[PDB]
Design an enzyme around this catalytic site. Structure first.
Site, short mmCIF file in Angstrom:
data_model
loop_
_atom_site.label_atom_id
_atom_site.label_comp_id
_atom_site.label_asym_id
_atom_site.label_seq_id
_atom_site.Cartn_x
_atom_site.Cartn_y
_atom_site.Cartn_z
N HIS A 15 -35.51 3.44 -143.24
CA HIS A 15 -35.63 2.84 -144.57
C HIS A 15 -36.77 3.55 -145.36
CE1 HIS A 15 -36.60 -0.03 -147.90
NE2 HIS A 15 -37.71 -0.43 -147.25
N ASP A 37 -37.14 28.80 -168.01
CA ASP A 37 -36.77 28.31 -166.65
C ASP A 37 -38.10 28.02 -165.94
OD1 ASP A 37 -35.48 28.13 -163.75
OD2 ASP A 37 -33.85 27.97 -165.28
N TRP A 47 -42.82 4.63 -140.11
CA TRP A 47 -42.74 5.90 -140.81
C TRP A 47 -44.06 6.64 -140.57
CZ3 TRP A 47 -45.13 8.04 -145.52
CH2 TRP A 47 -46.19 7.20 -146.05
N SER A 86 -40.07 22.12 -148.39
CA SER A 86 -39.37 21.96 -149.66
C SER A 86 -40.37 21.59 -150.78
CB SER A 86 -38.40 20.74 -149.54
OG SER A 86 -37.91 20.61 -150.85
N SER A 87 -41.20 20.55 -150.55
CA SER A 87 -42.23 20.18 -151.57
C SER A 87 -43.38 21.14 -151.73
CB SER A 87 -42.79 18.86 -151.21
OG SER A 87 -41.76 17.86 -151.39
N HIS A 107 -52.48 8.92 -147.92
CA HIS A 107 -52.93 8.25 -149.13
C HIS A 107 -52.58 9.12 -150.37
CE1 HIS A 107 -54.21 5.40 -151.93
NE2 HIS A 107 -54.52 6.48 -152.66
N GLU A 139 -50.05 10.95 -150.61
CA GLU A 139 -48.65 10.77 -150.77
C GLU A 139 -48.33 9.64 -151.66
OE1 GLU A 139 -44.45 11.00 -150.44
OE2 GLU A 139 -46.08 12.47 -150.32
N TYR A 175 -50.10 8.43 -154.23
CA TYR A 175 -50.36 8.86 -155.62
C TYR A 175 -49.33 9.89 -156.11
CZ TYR A 175 -54.13 5.78 -154.85
OH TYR A 175 -54.78 4.60 -154.65
N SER A 203 -45.66 6.84 -169.75
CA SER A 203 -46.34 7.11 -170.99
C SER A 203 -45.28 7.58 -172.07
CB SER A 203 -47.35 8.22 -170.82
OG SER A 203 -48.41 7.68 -170.02
N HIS A 220 -59.06 3.59 -145.33
CA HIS A 220 -58.55 2.23 -145.58
C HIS A 220 -57.25 1.86 -144.96
CE1 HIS A 220 -56.97 3.68 -149.81
NE2 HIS A 220 -55.94 3.59 -149.01
N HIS A 221 -56.60 2.82 -144.28
CA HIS A 221 -55.43 2.54 -143.49
C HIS A 221 -55.83 2.33 -142.02
CE1 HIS A 221 -52.57 3.26 -146.68
NE2 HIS A 221 -53.39 4.19 -147.12
N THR A 261 -57.42 3.88 -163.29
CA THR A 261 -56.08 3.35 -163.34
C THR A 261 -56.05 2.31 -164.50
OG1 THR A 261 -55.76 3.58 -160.99
CG2 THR A 261 -54.18 2.29 -162.19
N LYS A 321 -55.46 3.74 -167.96
CA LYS A 321 -54.09 3.95 -168.30
C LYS A 321 -53.36 2.73 -168.70
CE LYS A 321 -51.99 7.45 -166.18
NZ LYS A 321 -52.13 8.24 -167.46
N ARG A 326 -46.21 -7.20 -139.50
CA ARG A 326 -45.24 -6.17 -139.96
C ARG A 326 -44.48 -5.70 -138.75
NH1 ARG A 326 -48.06 -1.42 -143.22
NH2 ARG A 326 -45.92 -0.51 -143.02
#
Ligand SMILES: CCCCCCCCCCCCCCCCCC(=O)OCC(COC(=O)CCCCCCCCCCCCCCCCC)OC(=O)CCCCCCCCCCCCCCCCC
Ligand code: HEA
Ligand SMILES: CCCCC/C=C/C/C=C\C/C=C\C/C=C\CCCC(=O)O[C@H](COC(=O)CCCCCCCCCCCCCCCCC)COP(=O)(O)OCCN
Ligand SMILES: CCCCCC/C=C/CCCCCCCCCC(=O)O[C@H](COC(=O)CCCCCCCCCCCCCCC)COP(=O)(O)OC[C@@H](O)CO
Ligand SMILES: CCCCCCCCCCO[C@@H]1OC(CO)[C@@H](O[C@H]2O[C@H](CO)[C@@H](O)[C@H](O)[C@@H]2O)[C@@H](O)[C@H]1O
Ligand code: CUA
Ligand SMILES: [O-][O-]
Ligand SMILES: [Cu+2]
Ligand SMILES: [Mg+2]
Ligand code: NA
Ligand SMILES: [Zn+2]
EC number: 7.1.1.9
Lengths: 49, 57, 43, 71, 259, 46, 514, 93, 84, 104, 144, 227, 75
Positions: free
Chosen positions: G61, G91, G126, G156-157, G240, G242, G244, G255, G290-291, G316, G319, G438
């Site tokens: 998932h 391009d 995950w 790829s990324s 982390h 990831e 953002y 925006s 923090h994880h 944040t 924004k 969890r």
């Protein structure tokens, strides 16, 4: 010239609402779902030991 | 050795419509065919292997 | 935005068919697997 | 004849009026919350423990039969 | 007809064959690791080499032979290469991280010390120092190559690039011999793990960088570079310096400080 | 060179809406069905 | 012709369309995995089997939604379609390497399906922590197929990010400075610099897991001196950032949608929006532990990570307040895209604030590994990232296809999705505070009420998902062609027509320096 | 010696750009054009090889918002935001 | 530092070649000496079956599964000790 | 700048004798961006510019946008029309209401 | 009147409250009487009739402000349709309860719950606020 | 334990759990205020026909909406970090208990004096006694003396697990090769429940923790009897 | 002796080195006394501390490895 909403909006709203309320009331109360509400105020405690 | 860059420029700029990967001539077509056949065939083989490994033996 | 009227109008009836067929395509396969879970689970 | 109404900065006027209302409301809710939730909770814990007797709570539990280690 | 200076690339099959090859090499390592067969992997290694060969051939067609690398194109490729090297630096970073984490707080299983009980490290003053001077020498001989090419001197360009390649090669042979001679192995706990995995990915990069210098040697033989336009050479010289710099960090951290 | 314009810049045909319905249905339908069939696969395995 | 165009593409719009089709198909996979979760959970007792198959579904998932739906749609899809148009470029910088970023994704997805078909799946989460993910507690091919899937999606990324950075930096009109590119282009550049720096760390860490599993290394195995918590650090150092990366292209689409439907020629406080995205991207690299607040970390470490994490609220909030200020005074158009944007602003704010609650490591001891975290992150992902995608999708669908959606139907889909997601995830806060863990296939009976309702909400979102598909069919089936679009003077991507030609900006824009 | 120069060996578009830069010309739009005063009598002159081209106007120095519009062959058009005038001067390369 | 030499008028090819043959390659030849000197077999230590070494959680995917990739019988014992 | 200098700039703008149709549109479209309803003297000057440009329809549209700019302050538009009435009379400008163009 | 896709690069007409004077007229071709009307428009507008003034308005603009700004009954359709589909969702949940879900655990039987509730009261589950706090241990009943 | 329809935390059982409750109330009030301010402003922005659509000046309002949040973060961090350092001060435990996670059960060692250790496994649902809690009960509970400071040490012998007891505000990961420490003090006797809180494979849902808190003298006799 | 006291050398959540150190100390002490022929009971504090702190499977594995000759720490 009236559009879709002028012609049908009232019937869409009335019967969408009615149907949604009917089927969710039935789902919630008639088919054996266990909600597990609080016993507070509802269950009479019974000896277990 | 001698500088034959000019001949290759003439070859690769020939106005024959060919994409660059095939513009060198018939050897391009063979190597392309070899690569694509190994990629596609080996992909079908990976799926077969997946099928095979998907069940207990 | 402004656009033109549909080139190939989709009537209420045709939208009903497109919607019904869309929902069935999600519901039926899954419903078939879940309906048969028991025979999976224990077989 | 009609009098001249205010005609300028009407959006800004509305803005200021409501932001100050949202501040007023915010203080009012802070007030209510730190009274119906926060002080209520502190008073619940303080009241519970002020005369709490832990041995007696234990003896009640032991007699009701809950423990593996105390009958 | 365009009136910008950027390159519209002809439709190409190499992106798909490169992707399929990544699938065959990954599926192939899985089959090797778990199903005792090397066949998918050998196929994927082969399509991968053919894809890189034709793709880079075509970039050479497009530039040397077709003139698509205007200054604005070339400036993009400079950015692409800096960014790629940045991402390889971060990749090495995670392995240095692993190494300092285990060596700085050695756990009871190792004896609570570093190097672990039972590990006898190589002496950093013997073949590791020799490797260090080999790669530093190759950074001097490639800078000579580069100046020769800019000053338009074909023959000294070729002799300096050749010397630079032979040194890469010597480093690779020295390191293969050290691997065989080392009394510890990859399975010797976190010491052999960090040592072989960090220095092994570095050796792989030295092999790749040397291959790229060899591509440059043959393109220079064929007169592809001008005294002013030679991006493939620059990129291979940046990569090469990147390889030397990662060695210096490995030598200082792992061979000298971790011994 | 390629066709340009609405309905032409896409890898699937929209020339007929019922053929399009069928293709979309198989497309999104296969994606949705797959986890159900993989669970079933895993259940029927052991 | 078909094969040359669609398998050998070197065009940014067509490769953008490939990403959009791939992400929509992954979206259907990920929705099915999520309905399998909530079907197990919607009633106490075991439905599917023990925790292994349940958490194989949980793991897939998340991997599907993140790597196969979100990142492709936002970065490969909207990024490829829009960024070169918004800067008037012909391009991407590396148009052929761009096509390989695309075609790496179906093999990556195939490896992930392979993993769940062989053996008993990877039921690892995950985050793939060892030793559960190691070769003793997860023997056989599934976890290796998972790691290889992540390696393909990573390559790829990383190649994608290099292409975007380069295109953005190098291919603007000569007069356009960085401070004259739209905020969506800024958000894609920011996100690409995060990809570039974070994915190689993940690749080093999963590669160590791979070698621990197959080459007898012991990076994470205490028996050879290694440490499982090391994998966590390397993973979260990518993980982390990831998150953002998942929301930054969203902040960019938001925006443009708010500015456009407020009738405005520009977002409020442009340079503050730039600052805020760069700050968020910088801070997002120094907070990852923090994880890890229950792993047994020293107190001052915990104090620093609590503080550094909270600081992200500042940029944040700039924004959030500047989107409000863009709405302020606007000629508000109540288009379906605007509604998805406004729902975004509010629901992302809710989820960012339960994020602030979690940043407090003292309270996180009790919240960690409970549904309170699951409610946090579904507010920002299934409401935030997803609502931005849906908003951007309805907004730009007429640009990409040349046809219009039916707005009434699109407003109906919004309403149904809004009720479904909130009914799904709002009660998960209660399950969390009350302690439900969890990654559980079943729960003590006290938790039954909130899990029943949460499962019913998930079925409402299913209904919205199926409606969306029909809605997209109806648009292609009716063929109402676009004639006129407002505000092109500040929305360059629309100025070549709908759909724009295959080649656009073959003659570049003229822009004077003065 | 033995290494070709760009003069000797550059080809295709790269040579075209090099030769033109030699003549002080910019057929491939590498450089940003400088604004005239932008009045009706002194419009910005916008070359093109067709009969329209997109213009972007940065009305004031440091604006971050660019104003975008098609300039067509014909009478000068004004920026819809600051009114500076632009005129297309079509055809060639 | 400045190391301890001079030049800097220009940095051209002549200089860098001067450095290649006058500094870099000599150093490599000195380190090659020094190594082909401290080389030749040092004495293998007693085998002790430490549990943090010679790890095997899964057989290697080549050979008999129990030999490392560049196994040198002289100096790499197996988990049960040095080979015959 | 004071309100009075703002207004006077706008009066001057629309009072230019050879104002063209581009400038008339640019001025109204810019002006209605502000957080104000234009003073009657500014509207007067734009209505007179409509006359020199022989554009009846734009004069009527200008009166519609004044009513629109006042939002829910229903007192504003009648006051502004009251004040413009000599000019409306002088130029023969009918209001949107006199033309039925207020009917939805 | 007829707008064409091949006109995209050209200024276009739009009815927007905030862009009251669009870049082009709504109608640009004129019949013989419309041409005469535009000539009459160069003379005093007081001599134009109400009908003529309307026709000049309608040539320049498509919809008036009152037209372009009118509200619709669309909300009835969106809210009623959303409800209908949320109602349809309950049908899915009914089917799932009937065909997929088996009996729940025995620990939700009424007598089990009564015993379990007693035991939680005897172990004083949440005795400050949550649960036992709501029981009256003196009167032996739920606090009123 | 949690009870049906519970909205918030389990009632506190230790002074530090109470401290978390009051800090959560302080924080949640901030959370509800900011989110309701945002929803309010959104609806304010969207409920007027007045417009102002020209360029707006930003350097002024950005002060407020950068300083106000900074101040709020400080109003959160201060109590947050007072609680953090509190949970860290030296305290002198009377007793150390180890727990080891396994797939899928916990074992407990109380080895300060004697070698006492046992395994603690979930009571299977078909073997529950009348009144007992599905998924929550164990055969052998962790008996501990109430009103005393206990050092708990947590590790694992196979995969990760994590040892949690919400009402005491405890969650400490169980990691192999590592010995993590936490302190526990209950203000009250009674039964306190937790569940494994790190994914650990097929029965992660089914390896709970039940602590049985009693007077010291009952704890001493229980220990003796478990040798 | 009730339990092992706070030790300022191991103030943090991770107590693994506290256990190992005391296990080492005890056995280095046992050795030194039994070497220089004399009293093992001076070593008692460390044995109590490591017994209190150290998981039983770790003690047992360390004992087994000191017997086997494969204990990696220095005693
Ligand atoms: C779905 C089922 C809900 C069940 C309701 C409770 C049953 C009560 C029994 C009747 C018995 C009640 C008496 C017992 C009191 C217990 C006190 C306690 O222990 O206290 C602990 C509780 C306190 O929670 C509550 O006190 C209930 C919270 C309800 C907040 C209402 C706003 C949300 C809208 C309402 C429906 C949700 C849909 C939208 C969700 C999206 C987010 C808003 O724990 C929570 O933290 C849960 C919430 C987590 C926080 C997310 C924070 C931001 C949310 C959104 C802000 C909305 C702003 C505008 C306000 C927006 C107006 C609509
Ligand atoms: C789109 C994805 C996304 C994003 C953007 C975020 C954003 C944030 N996250 Fe979240 N996070 C996740 C996805 C995301 N997260 C995921 C998937 C996990 C779990 C991973 C796993 O374990 O599987 C997670 C887990 C997670 C944890 C770990 C909890 C645990 O497991 O115990 C924490 C802890 O600090 C955290 C904090 C935050 C914070 C402070 C933000 C901040 O960026 C939010 C900042 C935003 C705001 C605060 C709202 C807007 C601001 C204002 C209106 C200004 C005024 C506000 C204040 C003064 C406070 N997140
Ligand atoms: C001479 C220097 C050059 C080194 C390179 C050549 C060696 C073989 C091939 C691989 C090299 C590169 C990958 C590095 C990975 C693993 C370790 C390699 C380092 C090495 O070569 O180590 C050897 C072990 O090799 C082993 O297991 C080898 C196992 C061989 C299988 C390799 C496994 C490949 C799997 C890696 C997948 C990589 C994923 C990367 C993703 C990139 C980012 C997306 C050391 O031999 P030993 O006998 O243990 O000790 C010697 C004692 N006398
Ligand atoms: C046993 C042997 C096999 C070993 C295994 C695999 C390794 C082999 C890869 C070796 C790399 C070879 C790269 C050759 C590229 C040649 C193309 C080239 O160099 O193209 C140049 C452009 O640069 C460009 O694209 C630059 C392109 C950059 C390429 C950088 C490559 C690094 C690749 C990494 C692959 C593995 C990843 C790391 C593992 C973690 C062309 O422009 P110029 O040079 O300006 O010429 C033009 C003038 O002539 C006009 O006057
Ligand atoms: C989590 C997402 C899923 C949400 C819920 C799905 C909603 C309803 C799905 C409908 O699915 C079907 O319904 C059946 C019964 O209603 C099935 O027929 C079964 O039932 C019969 C009659 O009971 C027989 O006629 C058949 O052989 C058959 O297998 C079955 O095949 C299936 O396609
Ligand atoms: Cu043990 Cu989860
Ligand atoms: O990750 O928040
Ligand atoms: Cu995070
Ligand atoms: Mg955890
Ligand atoms: Na369940
Ligand atoms: Zn301008």
């Amino acid at each position: 010239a009236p559009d879709f909403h002028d012609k049908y909006g009232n019937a869409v709203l009335a019967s969408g609402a009615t149907f949604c309320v009917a089927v969710w009331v039935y789902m919630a109360t008639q088919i054996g779902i266990e909600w597990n509400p609080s016993p507070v105020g509802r269950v009479t405690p019974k000896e277990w030991r | 050795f001698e500088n034959r860059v000019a001949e290759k420029q003439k070859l690769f700029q020939e106005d024959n419509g060919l994409p660059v990967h095939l513009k060198g001539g018939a050897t391009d077509n063979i190597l392309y065919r070899v690569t694509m056949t190994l990629c596609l065939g080996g992909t079908l083989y990976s799926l077969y292997c997946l099928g095979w490994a998907s069940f207990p033996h | 935005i402004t656009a033109k009227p549909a080139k190939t109008p989709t009537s209420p009836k045709e939208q009903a068919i497109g919607l019904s067929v869309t929902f069935l395509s999600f519901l039926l396969p899954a419903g078939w697997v879940l309906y048969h879970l028991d025979n999976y689970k224990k077989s | 004849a009609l009098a001249k109404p205010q005609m300028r900065g009407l959006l800004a006027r509305r803005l200021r009026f409501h932001i100050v209302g949202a501040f007023m409301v915010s203080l009012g809710f802070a007030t209510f919350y730190k009274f119906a939730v926060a002080e209520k909770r502190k008073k619940a814990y303080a009241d519970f423990y002020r005369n709490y007797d832990s041995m007696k709570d234990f003896e009640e539990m032991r007699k009701a039969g809950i423990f593996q280690s105390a009958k | 007809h365009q009136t910008h200076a950027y390159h519209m690339v002809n439709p190409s099959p190499w992106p798909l064959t490169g992707a399929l090859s990544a699938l065959l090499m990954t599926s192939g390592l899985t089959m090797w690791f778990h199903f005792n067969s090397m066949t998918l992997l050998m196929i994927g290694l082969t399509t991968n080499m053919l894809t890189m060969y034709q793709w880079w051939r075509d970039v050479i067609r497009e530039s040397t032979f077709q003139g698509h690398h205007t200054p604005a194109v070339q400036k993009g490729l400079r950015y692409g290469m800096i960014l790629f090297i940045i991402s390889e630096v971060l990749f090495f970073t995670g392995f240095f991280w692993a190494f300092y984490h285990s060596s700085l707080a050695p756990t009871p299983e190792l004896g609570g010390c570093w190097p672990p009980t039972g590990i006898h490290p190589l002496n950093p003053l013997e073949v590791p120092l020799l490797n260090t001077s080999v790669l530093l020498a190759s950074g001097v001989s490639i800078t000579w190559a580069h100046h020769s090419l800019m000053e338009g001197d074909r023959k000294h360009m070729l002799q300096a690039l050749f010397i630079t390649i032979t040194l890469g090669v010597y480093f690779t042979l020295l390191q293969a011999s050290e691997y065989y001679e080392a009394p510890f192995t990859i399975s010797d706990g976190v010491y052999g793990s960090t040592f072989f995995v960090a220095t092994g990915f570095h050796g792989l990069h030295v092999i790749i960088g040397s291959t790229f210098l060899i591509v440059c040697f043959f393109r220079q033989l064929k007169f592809h570079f001008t005294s002013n336009h030679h991006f493939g050479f620059e990129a291979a010289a940046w990569y090469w310096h990147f390889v030397d710099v990662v060695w210096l960090f490995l030598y200082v951290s792992i061979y000298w400080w971790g011994s | 060179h390629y066709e340009e314009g609405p309905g032409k810049n896409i890898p699937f045909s929209v020339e007929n809406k019922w053929r399009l319905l069928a293709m979309m249905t198989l497309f999104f339908g296969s994606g949705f069905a797959a986890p159900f069939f993989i669970v079933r696969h895993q259940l029927l395995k052991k | 012709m078909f094969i040359n165009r669609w398998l050998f593409s070197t065009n940014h719009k067509d490769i953008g369309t490939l990403y959009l089709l791939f992400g929509a198909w992954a979206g259907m996979v990920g929705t099915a995995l999520s309905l399998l979760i909530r079907a197990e959970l919607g009633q106490p007792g075991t439905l599917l089997g023990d925790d292994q198959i349940y958490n194989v579904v949980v793991t897939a998932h998340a991997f599907v939604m993140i790597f196969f739906m979100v990142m492709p749609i936002m970065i490969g899809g909207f990024g490829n379609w829009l960024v070169p148009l918004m800067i008037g470029a012909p391009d991407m910088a590396f148009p052929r390497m761009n096509n390989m970023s695309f075609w790496l994704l179906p093999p990556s997805f195939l490896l992930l399906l392979a993993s769940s078909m062989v053996e008993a799946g990877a039921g690892t989460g995950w985050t793939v922590y060892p030793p559960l993910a190691g070769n003793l507690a997860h023997a056989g091919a599934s976890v290796d197929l998972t790691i290889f899937s992540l390696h393909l999606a990573g390559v790829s990324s990383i190649l994608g990010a290099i292409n975007f950075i380069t295109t953005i930096i190098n291919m603007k009109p000569p007069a356009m400075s960085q401070y004259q590119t739209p905020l969506f282009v800024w958000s894609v550049m920011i996100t690409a610099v995060l990809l570039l720096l974070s994915l190689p760390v993940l690749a080093a860490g999963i590669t160590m897991l791979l070698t621990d599993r197959n080459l007898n290394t012991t990076f994470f195995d205490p028996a050879g001196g290694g440490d499982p918590i090391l994998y966590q650090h390397l993973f979260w150092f990518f993980g982390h950032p990831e998150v953002y990366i998942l929301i930054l292209p969203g902040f960019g689409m938001i925006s443009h949608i708010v500015t456009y439907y407020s009738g405005k020629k520009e977002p409020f406080g442009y340079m503050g929006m730039v600052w805020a995205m760069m700050s968020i991207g910088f801070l997002g690299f120094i907070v990852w532990a923090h994880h890890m607040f229950t792993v047994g970390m020293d107190v001052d470490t915990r104090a620093y990570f609590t503080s550094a994490t909270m600081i992200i609220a500042i940029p944040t909030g700039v924004k959030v307040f500047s989107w409000l200020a863009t709405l302020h005074g606007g000629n508000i158009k109540w288009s379906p895209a605007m509604m998805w944007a406004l729902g975004f602003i509010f629901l992302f704010t809710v989820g960012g604030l339960t994020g602030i609650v979690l940043a407090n490591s003292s309270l996180d001891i009790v919240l960690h590994d409970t549904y309170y975290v699951v409610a946090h992150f579904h507010y920002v992902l299934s409401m935030g990232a997803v609502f931005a995608i849906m908003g951007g999708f309805v907004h730009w669908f007429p640009l990409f296809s040349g046809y219009t959606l039916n707005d009434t139907w699109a407003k109906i889909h919004f309403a149904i999705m809004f009720v479904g997601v909130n009914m799904t995830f709002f009660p998960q806060h209660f399950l969390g505070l009350s302690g439900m863990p969890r990654r559980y296939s079943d729960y003590p009976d006290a938790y039954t009420m909130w899990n029943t309702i949460s499962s019913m909400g998930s079925f409402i979102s299913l209904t919205a998902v199926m409606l969306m598909v029909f809605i997209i069919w109806e648009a292609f089936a009716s063929k109402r062609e676009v004639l006129t679009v407002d505000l092109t003077t500040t929305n360059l991507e629309w100025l070549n027509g709908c759909p724009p030609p295959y080649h656009t900006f073959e003659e570049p824009t003229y822009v004077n320096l003065k | 010696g033995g290494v070709p120069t760009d003069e000797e060996q550059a080809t295709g578009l790269e040579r075209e750009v090099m030769l033109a830069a030699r003549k002080g010309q910019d057929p491939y739009n590498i450089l940003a054009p400088k604004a005239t005063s932008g009045t009706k009598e002194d419009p910005n002159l916008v070359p093109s090889i067709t009969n329209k081209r997109i213009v972007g106007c940065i009305c004031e120095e440091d604006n971050s918002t660019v104003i975008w519009f098609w300039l067509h062959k014909g009478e000068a058009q004004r920026c819809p935001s600051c009114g500076t005038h632009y005129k297309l001067v079509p055809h060639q390369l | 530092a400045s190391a301890a030499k001079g030049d800097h008028g220009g940095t051209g090819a002549r200089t860098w070649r001067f450095l290649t043959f006058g500094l870099a390659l000599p150093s490599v030849a000195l380190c090659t000496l020094n190594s082909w000197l401290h080389s030749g077999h040092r004495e293998r230590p007693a085998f002790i079956p430490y549990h943090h070494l010679r790890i095997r959680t899964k057989p290697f995917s080549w050979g008999d599964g129990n030999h490392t990739f560049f196994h040198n019988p002289r100096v790499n014992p197996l988990p049960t000790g040095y080979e015959k | 700048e004071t309100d009075e200098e703002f207004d006077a700039r706008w009066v001057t703008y629309f009072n230019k004798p050879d104002i063209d149709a581009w400038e008339l549109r640019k001025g109204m479209n810019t002006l209605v961006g502000y957080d104000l309803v234009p003073e009657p003297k500014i509207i007067d000057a734009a209505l007179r510019a409509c006359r020199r440009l022989n554009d009846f329809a734009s004069a009527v549209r200008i009166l519609e946008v004044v009513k629109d700019k006042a939002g829910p302050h229903k007192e504003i538009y009648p006051y502004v029309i009251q004040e413009l009435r000599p000019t409306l009379n002088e130029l023969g400008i009918s209001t949107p209401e006199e033309l039925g163009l207020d009917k939805v | 009147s007829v707008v064409k896709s091949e006109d995209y690069a050209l200024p276009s007409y739009v009815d927007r409250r905030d862009y009251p004077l669009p870049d082009v007229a709504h109608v640009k071709n004129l019949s013989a009487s419309q041409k005469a009307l535009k000539e009459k428009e160069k003379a005093s507008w007081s001599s134009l009739s109400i009908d003529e003034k309307v026709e000049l308005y309608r040539l320049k603009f498509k919809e008036s402000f009152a037209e372009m700004n009118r509200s619709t009954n669309e909300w009835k359709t969106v809210v009623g349709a959303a409800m209908f589909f949320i109602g349809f969702t309950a049908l899915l949940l009914i089917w799932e309860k009937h065909y997929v879900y088996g009996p729940i655990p025995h620990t939700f039987e009424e007598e089990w719950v009564a015993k379990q509730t007693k035991r939680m009261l005897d172990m004083k589950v949440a005795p400050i606020q949550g649960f036992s706090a709501k029981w009256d241990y003196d009167k032996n009943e739920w606090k009123k | 334990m949690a009870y049906p329809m519970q909205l918030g935390f389990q009632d506190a059982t230790s002074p530090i759990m109470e401290e978390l409750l009051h800090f959560h109330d302080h924080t949640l009030m901030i959370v509800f205020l900011i989110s309701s301010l945002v929803l309010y402003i959104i609806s304010l922005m969207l409920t007027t026909k007045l417009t102002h659509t020209s360029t707006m000046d930003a350097q002024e309002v950005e002060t407020i909406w950068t300083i106000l949040p900074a101040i709020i973060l400080i109003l959160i961090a201060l109590p947050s970090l007072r609680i953090l350092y509190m949970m860290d001060e030296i305290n002198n435990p009377s007793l150390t208990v180890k727990t080891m996670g396994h797939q899928w059960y916990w074992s407990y060692e109380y080895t300060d004096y004697e070698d006492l250790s046992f395994d603690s496994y979930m009571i299977p649902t078909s073997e529950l006694k009348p009144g007992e809690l599905r998924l929550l009960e164990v055969d052998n509970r962790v008996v501990l003396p109430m009103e005393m400071t206990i050092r708990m040490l947590v590790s694992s012998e196979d995969v990760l697990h994590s040892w949690a007891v919400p009402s005491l505000g405890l969650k400490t990961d169980a990691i192999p090769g590592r010995l993590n420490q936490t302190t526990l003090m209950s203000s009250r006797p009674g039964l306190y429940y937790g569940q494994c809180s790190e994914i650990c494979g097929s029965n992660h849902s089914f390896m709970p923790i039940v602590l049985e808190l009693v007077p010291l003298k009952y704890f001493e006799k229980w220990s003796a009897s478990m040798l | 002796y009730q339990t092992a006291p706070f030790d300022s050398r191991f103030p943090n959540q991770n107590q693994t080195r506290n256990c190992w150190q005391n296990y080492l100390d005890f056995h280095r002490c046992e050795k030194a006394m039994t070497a220089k022929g004399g009293d093992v009971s001076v070593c008692e504090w460390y044995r109590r501390v490591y017994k209190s702190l150290c998981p039983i499977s770790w003690v047992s594995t360390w004992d087994d490895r000191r017997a086997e000759g494969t204990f990696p720490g220095k005693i």
